[PDB]
């Protein structure tokens, strides 16, 4: 299973059934037949396969990398450094894109179970999704089709700039 | 460009220091190519005269193949003498003149400052 602490749910409140009529409903009838036809075939079927598989057991592993240094402390035309600091930022890159596909999954989820409250119930995650759209605007937006690790730095170094001096100006 | 270099010893096809390089091997790339070529050579000399291509004139096809290996190896035996020979010079005029070739201070990326092209 996942795991829910990167996907915060909250826990469910289900009223009970209390009716006011004599006429039975065909929906608990319908899914009295849906445990007996489905759910009982089904969940045997998977139970076969489940010991089917506990029978040859093998693992796999999640790919760690290790931290080599960033761009900023690489030698200028040094390709031997550079290409270890690009493909880092790279492999970044698409972890931080991952993130913000993440919070964007969280967003919609919140919506959609909040359902007619959701402008009101869903004001953290709405916080939390400008947030990263705003860090990652500021990160990686401008760049092009020909990204690179030294025109990232050089788009922040000039943020720092535009900063530092408008910090000068309010000084 | 190296006419004063091989001016004081003249209308030498492999001097002796051409000794002192690793002569090429009989498997090389260039030498299977120049075999392949004069194969070709055999062939067109076959197809010209309206001779079976691939049957006719066997002996003529292996000396074909021989006489442009043969020519091929003492032409790239030269060709890596001289460029051994551009090498030793370029290095030599380097460590000759220090005070023409400076070390350049190599310096990181957190101190040169490149200007951002925003692509929108």
Known sequence: SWDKDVYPEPPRRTPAPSPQTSLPNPITYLTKAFDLLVDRPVTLVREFIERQHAKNKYYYYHREFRRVPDITECHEKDVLCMFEAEMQWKRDYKVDQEIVNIIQERLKACQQREGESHRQNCAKELQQFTQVVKAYQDRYHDLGAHYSARKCLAKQKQRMLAERKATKEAA | ?120
Not at chain 2, 7 to 30: C, G, I, N, V
Not at chain 2, 90 to 108: A, G, L, N, V
């Open chain 2, 1 to 120: 460009m190296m006419t004063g270099r091989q001016a004081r010893a003249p209308l030498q096809f492999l001097p002796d220091e051409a000794r002192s390089l690793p002569p090429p091997k009989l498997t090389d790339p260039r030498l299977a190519y120049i075999g392949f070529l004069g194969y070709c050579s055999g062939l067109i000399d076959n197809a010209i005269r309206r001779r079976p291509v691939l049957s006719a004139g066997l002996h003529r096809q292996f000396l074909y193949i021989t006489s442009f290996v043969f020519v091929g190896y003492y032409l790239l035996k030269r060709q890596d003498y001289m460029y051994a020979v551009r090498d030793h010079d370029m290095f030599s005029y380097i460590k000759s003149h220090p005070e023409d070739f400076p070390e350049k201070d190599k310096k990181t990326y957190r101190e040169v400052f490149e200007e951002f092209h925003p692509v929108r």
